[PDB]
């Protein structure tokens, strides 16, 4: 009967959405990470020179 296919598709769709949310949160962290690193090191390079 159809309901098992619906349930499989439902929980795999929750994983599709959870995977996409992890991918989105990953991108947002990388946009913070490079900002912290590059600006700190640029300022240290300037404080040195």
């Amino acid at each position: 009967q159809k309901q098992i296919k619906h349930m499989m598709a439902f929980i795999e769709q929750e994983a599709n959405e959870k995977a996409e949310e992890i991918d989105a949160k990953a991108e947002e962290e990388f946009n913070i990470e490079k900002g912290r690193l590059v600006q700190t090191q640029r300022l240290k390079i300037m404080e040195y020179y």
């Binding site: 009967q1 309901q3 098992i4 349930m7 439902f10 929980i11």
Partner: protein, 109 residues
């Protein structure tokens, strides 16, 4: 005490999304519950009932469902006079209950 009845194999265990419940049903209401099994709440696993015990007034049976549906299931079960027994399997507690009555008898002696 259900440790005299149930086995680890009678349940879905450690799932992220499924739970197996125990329902106690009046013996005259057996065919009504068999008719309701497919329909009583959303996201129940079809055609997967199993009677684990039976008695003069009633019988005790499996159902398995998506973990969201448990409240609708137990509520609509109570509206149909089917009774969801609160139980969760852990073999260490089943073994502990089998040990304890013998310990109590030993300590009394």
């Amino acid at each position: 005490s259900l440790a005299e009845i149930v086995k680890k194999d009678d349940f879905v265990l450690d799932s992220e999304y499924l739970v197996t419940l125990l329902v106690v049903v009046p013996k005259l209401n057996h065919n009504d519950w068999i008719k309701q099994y497919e329909t009583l709440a959303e996201m129940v696993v079809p055609r997967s009932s199993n009677v684990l015990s039976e008695d003069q007034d009633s019988y005790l049976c499996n159902v398995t469902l998506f973990k969201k549906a448990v409240d609708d299931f137990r509520h609509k079960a109570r509206e149909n006079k089917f009774i969801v027994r609160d139980f969760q399997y852990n073999e260490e507690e089943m073994r502990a209950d089998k040990e304890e009555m013998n310990r109590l008898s030993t300590d009394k002696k």
